[PDB]
Amino acid sequence: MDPFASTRTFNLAMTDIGEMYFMPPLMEALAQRAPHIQISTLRPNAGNLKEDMESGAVDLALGLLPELQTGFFQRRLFRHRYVCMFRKDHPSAKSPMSLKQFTELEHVGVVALNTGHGEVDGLLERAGIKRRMRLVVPHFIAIGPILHSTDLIATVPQRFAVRCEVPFGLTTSPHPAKLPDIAINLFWHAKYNRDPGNMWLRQLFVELFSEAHHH
Amino acid sequence: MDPFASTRTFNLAMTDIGEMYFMPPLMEALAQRAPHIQISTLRPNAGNLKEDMESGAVDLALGLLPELQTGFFQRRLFRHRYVCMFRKDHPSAKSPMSLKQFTELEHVGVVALNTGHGEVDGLLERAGIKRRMRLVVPHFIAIGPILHSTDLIATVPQRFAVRCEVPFGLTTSPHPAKLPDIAINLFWHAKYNRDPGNMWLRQLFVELFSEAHHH
Ligand SMILES: O=C(O)c1ccccc1O
Ligand SMILES: O=C(O)c1ccccc1O
Ligand SMILES: O=C(O)c1ccccc1O
Ligand SMILES: O=C(O)c1ccccc1O
Numbered sequence: 001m002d003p004f005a006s007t008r009t010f011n012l013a014m015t016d017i018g019e020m021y022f023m024p025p026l027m028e029a030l031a032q033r034a035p036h037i038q039i040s041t042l043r044p045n046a047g048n049l050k051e052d053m054e055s056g057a058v059d060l061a062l063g064l065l066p067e068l069q070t071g072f073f074q075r076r077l078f079r080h081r082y083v084c085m086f087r088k089d090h091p092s093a094k095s096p097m098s099l100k101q102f103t104e105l106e107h108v109g110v111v112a113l114n115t116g117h118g119e120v121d122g123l124l125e126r127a128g129i130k131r132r133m134r135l136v137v138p139h140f141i142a143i144g145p146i147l148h149s150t151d152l153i154a155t156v157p158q159r160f161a162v163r164c165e166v167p168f169g170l171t172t173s174p175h176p177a178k179l180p181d182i183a184i185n186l187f188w189h190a191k192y193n194r195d196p197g198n199m200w201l202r203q204l205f206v207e208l209f210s211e212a213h214h215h
Numbered sequence: 216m217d218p219f220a221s222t223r224t225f226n227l228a229m230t231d232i233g234e235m236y237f238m239p240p241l242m243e244a245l246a247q248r249a250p251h252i253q254i255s256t257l258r259p260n261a262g263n264l265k266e267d268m269e270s271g272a273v274d275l276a277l278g279l280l281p282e283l284q285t286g287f288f289q290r291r292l293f294r295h296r297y298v299c300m301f302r303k304d305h306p307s308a309k310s311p312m313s314l315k316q317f318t319e320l321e322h323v324g325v326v327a328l329n330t331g332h333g334e335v336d337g338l339l340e341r342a343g344i345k346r347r348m349r350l351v352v353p354h355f356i357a358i359g360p361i362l363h364s365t366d367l368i369a370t371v372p373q374r375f376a377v378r379c380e381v382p383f384g385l386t387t388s389p390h391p392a393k394l395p396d397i398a399i400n401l402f403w404h405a406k407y408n409r410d411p412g413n414m415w416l417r418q419l420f421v422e423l424f425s426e427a428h429h430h
Binding site: 016019020023024025027028030031038039040041042043133134135136137138139141142145146148149150151152167 | 231234235238239240242243245246253254255256257258348349350351352353354356357360361363364365366367382
């Protein structure tokens with residue numbers, strides 16, 4: 001069936017950041033290419049996501065999702081690093097920040113339970129980096145106005161940080177801790193590898209967001 | 216014990232919008248008034264929130280939470296209405312929008328499962344207002360960039376809409392449907408009505424956010 005004929009609803013898993021990044025250009029393109037398709041999103045749910053992708057309840061997932069392993073396929077959209085972010089007139093924070101100073105200032109922690117970002121707190125702690133967690137929030141999206149009004153600092157994905165800098169008057173430093181890359185991928189389950197609708201929507205994601213040729 | 220002595224961690228339930236609104240001024244004030252208190256937040260969870268407030272696992276909840284009834288107390292911070300929001304150069308949407316036009320244009324739906332905002336879809340539908348839901352997302356925070364890049368419209372809390380207008384080039388119309396007020400309240404469970412730490416943090420919320428005298 002041609003894309004214009006499709007009235008299928010595709011269910012897509014992604015974080016708050018992912019929704020702000022992926023949804024505006026996707027829906028813009030869908031209105032031109034397949035205007036009767038419906039999209040619904042949901043936040044990643046580590047308890048349910050694999051099962052939901054196996055059963056076909058969730059069609060695609062986008063983000064840092066290291067648990068989607070055997071039985072899944074992935075295509076790389078881009079990769080980026082964690083950075084330290086803080087307000088631009090912070091009284092003492094500097095770029096490049098020292099590990100000592102990272103460890104002295106107070107933090108907004110981000111739990112990010114159902115994604116690879118949930119690994120950060122344990123990676124720091126096992127390296128023996130103790131942080132004074134003044135505030136802990138579950139997700140990244142509200143970090144910006146919090147850092148603006150305080151002397152707190154945060155460990156944040158670089159592409160999201162860059163989007164926060166001007167609107168909230170923040171700046172960033174390369175991260176002094178050794179943290180892994182953030183690989184942002186498009187995921188699907190092997191059972192839907194040759195489903196024509198899933199294939200078509202995957203190719204659209206690649207066309208709109210893949211930096212394999214770009215960069 | 217004096218507030219400077221307190222090292223207590225208070226756990227606070229609020230939406231993404233609530234976190235962006237309440238957390239920056241709260242943490243700013245805490246750094247001046249009670250600098251050793253820790254705060255952690257979480258999103259409202261209708262299955263668990265009442266039980267969690269009864270047991271003392273969640274100290275306070277902020278937002279539109281009509282299920283917190285017998286056994287709870289509430290203080291009004293402010294109230295506001297739903298509005299229609301869309302991009303400022305939308306090719307046909309106008310303010311004041313007609314019910315007919317609301318019903319003709321396509322929508323980004325917001326599920327808002329664990330809050331009173333989860334009532335909107337059913338309230339419209341029972342009034343016989345059928346909407347073409349092109350995109351459905353679980354929460355409000357990412358609505359802004361989506362509306363910017365599309366001809367979609369959305370039913371949104373007015374104070375959040377106003378914050379979106381300039382950064383995302385959107386505008387609003389009074390809502391043509393009959394929808395209830397959005398009462399934004401501070402909630403606590405009766406078991407903690409006279410806990411001195413809970414009382415102190417409630418009074419801070421009232422001082423920072425209550426519009427009872429203001430307005
Ligand atoms: O972490 C994500 O889920 C993400 C999604 C889109 C763009 C950048 C990101 O870090
Ligand atoms: O099966 C679908 O709904 C579909 C959607 C878009 C493109 C090709 C397709 O087969
Ligand atoms: O809906 C909310 O939870 C809310 C919170 C803060 C300010 C405005 C709001 O609508
Ligand atoms: O019990 C507390 O931790 C507390 C915190 C702030 C103010 C008064 C208090 O008793």
